[PDB]
């Protein structure tokens, strides 16, 4: 339930936050934040940012309280010199000794009740102000308080967004008055409760709403179905330990008067933050102004300016530069000659800084990319992956003229940089990852890959034979020759061979629907509809079409140029375009023949390297599973060791049947999957499929806890953070329909796996770029988690050292190398 950044302390019409679990949150995350001396400041940093985010909505005042539980030296350290003490480790109580003074300096009050827990204090102050006439809002991070949501009591946070009381009836479906019984059968972190079983794929995560009809665990009921009643009477003294969540009593003896804000002491406020090196982010209280009507200027000194350009087509390599401008101090610097203006500039700074550098490298000019507003908005919200969308949302427009577009890049920097300075996790991703990567992608598009012009023509007649054979197969059946592919003439054959049933909840009735997913469910019976869907997969390449590789070759260089977008994706990968090599059918005899066309120069060789099971390695690092890290530390196979601990057989007695069943779960865990989806891929039944997911969690305990931690930090957070700090704004994780919520959860635990795996590649490409310039090698492609280079034996060993030793992880990374003349000779 809600939360993302620490903070705390109620007051009428203001936030009602808690400061217990919010100190434990920022210690297990954002660990890469330290000073130049050697003082930790990874949790002390969340004070001047969170309380600032809430001050835009504002209210009256804020008070201050501490914890008083049995294990608290780390939690209640926010007032050690005041009152309160208990026992816990020595590594954290030194950091909170810096915030206790900054409390009374902003004009905030204080309160402390020793003996009673912090969770009991919030329940008392919520119901007391309701009777007086004040507006309150419960607010918390830990999954304990949500039952107190009623009239006049709302949901918000200084951390993130807003939720209503009707929004509680959406995903959950339960009422507030009975929400105390929700967490009494779930589990999650801090609460010891092991036992979910299964029965009907619901387990305990999707069963919750059925328990409302006759509780069973608390008062009445004797007999019922398994898993819904079997795990209550079996587990003794386990449910009697789960009542710590229910310990949120509203009847505690406390007076405390609600008063307004005090005078802020700004003389010492800035004195404490400078010793922490964060005394510069105090200029966030100002307002912003930006119009598209700017001034003009000629050519005198335009160093460090924001450029803008006009092209003939969206592809930089073939396009002609029609106009070029610059912006410094709110003035537009127009040019009479486009090709001459490229030599007067130091660096391409502004919108689409990568795409302009590619135009310069063709003419013979080394232009480096600097700052770009496209990458600034990408880190704050992944929905803004357009030069148009960043302008229209934040205040501005995107025209066809270069003079107005150059002046836009100056303003889109002023507004987005202010929001990025308060984010240290995104500044690391902008200085060390994004900006220097723009210099790498610019060279892969400018140089390109050489193709074998004698193979593509021969393949054009080879595949043509496979087409004519399957075309003659449908002509042999049904009798009369007709016009295929056309929806109007396909129904005429279905008139002769009657067989048209329903599909499901996926929208029907229209004319667009009779070309999307029609006949895809009918293949399980008739062979006539199978030789048209197997044909839909045999004849694709560039989906029916075949984009000519020898004709798309530049008349100047002689190589194919592929555009790599740095933003695009949601996870954090580099999506290609012209040609889109991101989605190629692998391990298939069709997609393997397309790679044979991609060769190197007359004396150069292709060195293709691929990340061997990185998506399974990252799963172990973010969880901390002692059994999953064990497989990689030794250097064994993951698909074999999983099936060993599940069935109870040794690693050598594992046959191809059990290794297959384990492979489907190891690839399914990336997006979660379900027992219904697992039953369709394998020959295993519905009731037997549930046991295969349980044996996976019995062998790997911390992995189950991680899914519960991501479901926590997702439905409540709004986004899903990675190891480095990437965002993913999705409010879909709290929906009414079963089809919208399930699709949202599938995207929750999919970004910290596929995104970090892509970020380790992004950070590797930056460190490998200086080493390629001296060795005489170059970078070419980036598909999925594979990097293709062109040099050969000396570079293969150097590239392996950079990719593996990119960041110190808990698991040992392994990369598979491959040297050859072509992409098929190198394989992975």
């Amino acid at each position: 339930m809600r939360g993302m950044l620490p903070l705390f302390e109620p007051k009428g019409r203001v936030l009602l936050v808690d400061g217990h679990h919010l100190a434990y949150r920022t210690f297990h995350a954002l660990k890469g934040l330290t000073t130049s001396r050697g003082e930790p400041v990874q949790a002390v940093y969340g004070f001047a940012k969170s309380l600032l985010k809430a001050l835009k909505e504002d209210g009256d005042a804020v008070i201050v309280v501490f914890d008083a539980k049995a294990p608290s030296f780390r939690h209640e350290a926010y007032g050690g010199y005041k009152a309160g003490r208990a026992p816990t480790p020595e590594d954290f109580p030194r950091q909170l000794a810096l915030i206790k003074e900054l409390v009374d300096l902003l004009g905030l009050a204080r309160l402390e009740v020793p003996g009673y827990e912090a969770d009991d204090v919030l329940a008392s102050l919520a119901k007391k102000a309701e009777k007086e006439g004040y507006e309150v809002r419960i607010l918390t991070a830990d999954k304990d308080l949500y039952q107190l949501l009623s009239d006049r009591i709302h949901v918000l946070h200084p951390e993130g967004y807003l939720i209503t009381p009707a929004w509680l009836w959406e995903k959950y479906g339960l009422r507030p008055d009975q929400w105390a019984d929700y967490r009494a059968l779930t589990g999650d972190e801090s609460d010891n409760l092991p036992g979910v079983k299964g029965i009907g794929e619901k387990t305990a995560r999707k069963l919750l709403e059925e328990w409302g009809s006759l509780e069973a665990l608390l008062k009445n009921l004797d007999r019922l179905k398994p898993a819904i009643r079997e795990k209550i009477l079996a587990h003794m003294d386990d449910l009697k330990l789960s009542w710590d969540l229910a310990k949120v009593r509203t009847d505690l003896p406390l007076e405390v008067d609600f008063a307004k804000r005090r005078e802020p002491d700004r003389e010492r406020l800035r004195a404490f933050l400078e010793r922490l090196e964060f005394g510069s982010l105090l200029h966030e209280f100002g307002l912003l102004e930006s119009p598209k009507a700017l001034e003009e200027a000629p050519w005198p000194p335009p160093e460090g300016a924001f450029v803008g350009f006009v092209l003939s087509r969206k592809e930089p390599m073939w396009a002609d530069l029609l106009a070029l401008a610059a912006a410094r101090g709110g003035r537009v610097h127009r040019a009479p000659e486009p090709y001459k203006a490229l030599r007067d500039l130091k660096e391409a700074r502004g919108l689409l800084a990568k795409d302009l550098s590619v135009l310069a490298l063709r003419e013979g000019l080394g232009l480096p990319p600097g700052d770009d507003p496209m990458l600034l908005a990408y880190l704050l919200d992944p929905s803004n992956t357009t030069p148009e969308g960043v302008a229209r949302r934040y205040g501005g427009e995107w025209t066809e003229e270069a003079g107005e577009r150059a002046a836009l890049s100056e303003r889109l920097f002023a507004n987005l940089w202010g929001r990025l300075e308060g984010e240290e996790r995104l500044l690391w991703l902008y200085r060390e990852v994004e900006r220097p990567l723009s210099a790498v992608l610019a060279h892969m598009e400018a140089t390109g890959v050489r193709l074998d012009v004698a193979y593509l023509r021969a393949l054009s007649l080879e595949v043509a034979e496979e087409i004519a054979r399957l075309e003659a197969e449908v002509f042999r059946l049904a009798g009369h020759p007709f016009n295929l592919n056309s929806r109007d003439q396909l129904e005429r054959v279905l008139f002769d061979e009657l067989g048209l049933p329903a599909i499901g909840k996926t929208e029907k009735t229209g004319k667009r629907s009779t070309s999307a997913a029609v006949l895809e469910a009918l293949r399980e019976a008739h062979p006539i509809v199978e030789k048209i869907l197997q044909y839909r997969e045999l004849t694709k390449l560039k989906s029916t079409y075949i984009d000519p590789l020898p004709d798309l070759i530049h008349p100047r260089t002689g190589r194919l140029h592929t555009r790599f977008n740095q933003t695009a994706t949601a996870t954090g990968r580099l999506s290609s375009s012209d040609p889109n090599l991101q989605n190629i059918p692998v391990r298939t005899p069709l997609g393997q023949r397309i790679r044979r066309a991609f060769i190197a120069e007359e004396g150069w060789l292709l060195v293709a390297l691929d990340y061997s099971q990185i998506e399974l390695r990252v799963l172990a690092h973010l969880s901390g599973d002692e059994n999953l890290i064990r497989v990689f530390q030794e250097g064994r196979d993951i698909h074999t060791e999983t099936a060993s601990w599940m069935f109870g057989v040794p690693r050598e007695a594992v046959d191809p049947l059990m290794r297959r069943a384990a492979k489907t779960i190891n690839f399914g865990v990336l997006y979660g999957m379900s027992a219904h989806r697992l039953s369709q891929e394998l020959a295993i039944p519905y009731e037997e499929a549930q046991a295969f997911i349980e044996r996976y969690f019995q062998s790997f305990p911390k992995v189950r806890a991680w899914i519960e931690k991501t479901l926590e930090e997702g439905r409540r957070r709004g986004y899903v953070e990675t190891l480095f700090g990437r965002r993913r704004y999705v409010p879909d994780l709290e929906a009414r329909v079963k089809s919208v919520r399930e699709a949202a959860e599938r995207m929750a635990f999919n970004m910290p796996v596929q995104g970090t795996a892509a970020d380790l590649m992004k950070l590797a490409m930056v460190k490998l770029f200086p080493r390629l310039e001296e060795m005489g090698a170059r970078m070419l492609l980036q598909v999925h988690d594979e990097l293709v280079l062109e040099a050969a034996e000396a570079v293969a060993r150097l590239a392996k050292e950079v990719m593996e030793g990119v960041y110190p992880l808990a698991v040992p990374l392994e990369v598979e190398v491959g040297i050859g003349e072509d992409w098929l000779s190198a394989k992975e």
């Epitope: 560039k542 989906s543 889109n580």
Partner: antibody, heavy 115, light 107 residues
């Protein structure tokens, strides 16, 4: 299904929306926008990917705006300063990508700009 | 932006005849897209880049063209082939479609 107004006044802002069910706008596929009629000559307006937007519209980018609402599972369209120069009859197309091609195509809806 | 023009517009053919239509551009064009649309339906695929046939498509249909002009040629006509055809490209283009070759049936 194309939902919106049947009539619009000059120099105003247009608001359209194509609803989708079953396959969400977060799994895969890019959703395009293309018009036709009366001269039977078509024109592009751009697309909208599963991740966000990623669109790169034609020379007339100062008027067209593409946005979306993932919670309701639909994508909006906003054409500012709509005049009589607009041909009209909007279709909601879709790109596949990885391997590019147009297959499906929208309904139609005949909208006219008049006073 | 390049201009797409389909020659001709309206034309009719009897079942069994040889049909031919062309799509031309202003500059050096590489590869073409071909479509089909019946009265009261959505437009779909038919023939692809330069020559070969798509997912399905009868053996009587055939493509040709390289350079400035790309054409479609049908060897055997039937009563179900009468519809409107369109052309597009994605080489040196930000993608836009043609005029429309409305093919009708002769009786």
């Amino acid at each position: 299904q194309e939902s919106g107004p049947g009539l619009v006044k000059p120099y105003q802002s247009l608001s359209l929306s194509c609803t989708v069910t079953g396959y969400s706008i977060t799994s895969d596929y890019a959703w395009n926008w293309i018009r036709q009629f009366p001269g039977n000559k078509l024109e592009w307006m751009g697309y909208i990917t599963y991740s966000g937007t990623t669109d790169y519209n034609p020379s007339l980018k100062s008027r067209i705006s593409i946005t979306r609402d993932t919670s309701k599972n639909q994508f909006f369209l906003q054409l500012n300063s709509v005049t009589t120069e607009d041909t009209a009859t909007y279709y909601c197309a879709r790109y596949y990508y990885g391997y590019w091609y147009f297959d499906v195509w929208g309904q139609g809806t005949t909208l006219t700009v008049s006073s | 932006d390049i201009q797409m023009t389909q020659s001709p517009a309206i034309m009719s053919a009897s079942p069994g005849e040889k049909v031919t239509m062309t799509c031309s551009a202003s500059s050096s064009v590489s590869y073409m897209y071909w479509y089909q649309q019946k009265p009261g339906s959505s437009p779909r695929l038919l023939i692809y880049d330069s020559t070969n046939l798509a997912s399905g498509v009868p053996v009587r249909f055939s493509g040709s063209g390289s350079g400035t002009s790309y054409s479609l040629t049908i060897s055997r006509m039937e009563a179900e082939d009468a519809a409107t055809y369109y052309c597009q490209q994605w080489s040196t283009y930000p993608l836009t479609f043609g005029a429309g070759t409305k093919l009708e049936l002769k009786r």
